[PDB]
Amino acid sequence: MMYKEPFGVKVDFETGIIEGAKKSVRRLSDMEGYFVDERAWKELVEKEDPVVYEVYAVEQEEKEGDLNFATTVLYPGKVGKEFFFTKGHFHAKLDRAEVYVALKGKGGMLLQTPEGDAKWISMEPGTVVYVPPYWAHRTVNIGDEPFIFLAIYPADAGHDYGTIAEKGFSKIVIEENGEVKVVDNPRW
Amino acid sequence: MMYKEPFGVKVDFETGIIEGAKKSVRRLSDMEGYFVDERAWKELVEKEDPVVYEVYAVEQEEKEGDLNFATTVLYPGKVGKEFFFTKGHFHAKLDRAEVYVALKGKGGMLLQTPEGDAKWISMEPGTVVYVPPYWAHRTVNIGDEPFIFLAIYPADAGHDYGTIAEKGFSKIVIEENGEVKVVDNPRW
Numbered sequence: 001m002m003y004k005e006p007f008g009v010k011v012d013f014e015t016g017i018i019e020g021a022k023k024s025v026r027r028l029s030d031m032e033g034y035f036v037d038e039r040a041w042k043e044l045v046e047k048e049d050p051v052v053y054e055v056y057a058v059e060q061e062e063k064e065g066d067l068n069f070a071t072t073v074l075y076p077g078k079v080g081k082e083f084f085f086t087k088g089h090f091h092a093k094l095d096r097a098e099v100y101v102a103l104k105g106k107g108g109m110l111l112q113t114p115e116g117d118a119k120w121i122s123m124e125p126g127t128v129v130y131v132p133p134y135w136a137h138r139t140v141n142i143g144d145e146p147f148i149f150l151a152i153y154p155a156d157a158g159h160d161y162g163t164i165a166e167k168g169f170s171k172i173v174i175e176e177n178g179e180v181k182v183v184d185n186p187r188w
Numbered sequence: 189m190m191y192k193e194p195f196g197v198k199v200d201f202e203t204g205i206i207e208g209a210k211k212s213v214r215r216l217s218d219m220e221g222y223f224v225d226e227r228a229w230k231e232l233v234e235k236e237d238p239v240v241y242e243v244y245a246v247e248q249e250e251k252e253g254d255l256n257f258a259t260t261v262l263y264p265g266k267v268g269k270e271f272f273f274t275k276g277h278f279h280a281k282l283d284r285a286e287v288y289v290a291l292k293g294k295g296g297m298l299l300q301t302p303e304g305d306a307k308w309i310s311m312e313p314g315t316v317v318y319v320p321p322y323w324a325h326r327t328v329n330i331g332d333e334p335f336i337f338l339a340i341y342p343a344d345a346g347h348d349y350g351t352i353a354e355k356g357f358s359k360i361v362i363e364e365n366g367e368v369k370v371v372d373n374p375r376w
């Protein structure tokens with residue numbers, strides 16, 4: 001039998017960078033129809049088009065039982081009152097769970113079942129989050145610096161962004177009067 | 189249908205402690221027939237029987253697609269010339285991979301195929317080790333302080349200790365003349 005090579009790689013807990021990883025970049029312009037305030041989205045995209053997040057992914061072939069891992073650097077920012085977040089997805093194989101290891105910054109995760117019932121888990125350095133089977137998941141940076149975490153996921157989990165792209169989450173995370181609020185999404 | 193509850197838990201990267209996790213403890217007496225120097229083992233068990241390592245495990249039902257995670261605190265020490273290590277295991281479902289995230293200390297992982305061919309990976313804080321399908325794996329603390337890491341594995345991976353308990357690994361990690369050597373196992 002042919003065996004894959006074991007390997008070690010350095011992850012910098014300060015920057016989220018993994019040498020030799022597939023680097024992915026999500027600009028604000030790539031997230032049309034994601035934020036509640038459309039005119040604020042339009043305004044910030046034309047003024048700056050900030051990078052919302054970067055992903056450093058170490059991925060195997062899509063084989064059951066095997067594991068991928070990836071860091072996300074989610075940048076600090078707001079669209080209107082709404083904090084920067086990742087697009088959010090269900091796994092293509094829905095029952096595939098996931099483990100997040102928060103490394104730096106302050107954020108949290110919004111999770112949601114196919115039926116639209118949502119949950120908010122705060123994340124700070126050292127917070128390990130268990131994303132159970134079937135839960136869509138989006139990370140949010142509620143802070144002033146990059147929110148950096150490591151995600152470990154089944155290599156055959158895949159990524160389904162379609163349903164979230166159109167409907168979003170049932171809850172949104174906003175700053176009102178200087179305070180972080182998880183409130184119902186008006187657009188849901 | 190019923191959905192499992194998402195949750196976050198604090199992991200102290202300094203201590204390896206996971207609040208509310210299942211705690212397992214391995215002392216030297218729990219490791220009979222593991223170390224090369226049979227008489228050194230006996231002496232230490234009778235005098236002290238020190239804790240070799242501790243595991244904090246957050247586990248789900250044994251279900252495909254799900255994930256478990258566990259920290260290990262591998263204490264520093266030697267049996268004869270041979271560094272403290274974990275028992276080592278194959279996964280019961282052999283094709284199940286694993287990811288380790290080194291958190292504190294200095295150490296490494298010994299891996300071995302069903303054939304007996306070996307690989308050594310050095311681990312220091314920040315090192316992420318990819319443990320491929322079919323590789324047995326054992327961690328070793330080659331330093332003076334606790335070696336702490338987080339492991340993330342398929343919830344249906346299982347733990348096969350049998351083969352390793354009787355024959356060990358093909359290589360041993362030892363200190364000869366103040367230097368750390370990965371040499372052939374004579375009792376193999």
Ligand SMILES: O=P(O)(O)OC[C@@H](O)[C@@H](O)[C@H](O)[C@@H](O)CO
Binds near residue numbers: 072088089138157158
């Ligand atoms: O894939 P996104 O929603 O744009 O959030 C982006 C990434 O953090 C995300 O891929 C993360 O690595 C895992 O959840 C993958 O299963």
Ligand SMILES: O=P(O)(O)OC[C@@H](O)[C@@H](O)[C@H](O)[C@@H](O)CO
Binds near residue numbers: 243275327341345347
């Ligand atoms: O299972 P052990 O050899 O007694 O070393 C003990 C632990 O480090 C070990 O359970 C680790 O969590 C993972 O490899 C489990 O798949």
Ligand SMILES: [Zn+2]
Binds near residue numbers: 137153
């Ligand atoms: Zn995911």
Ligand SMILES: [Zn+2]
Binds near residue numbers: 143144145
């Ligand atoms: Zn800050």
Ligand SMILES: [Zn+2]
Binds near residue numbers: 277279286325341
């Ligand atoms: Zn294992």
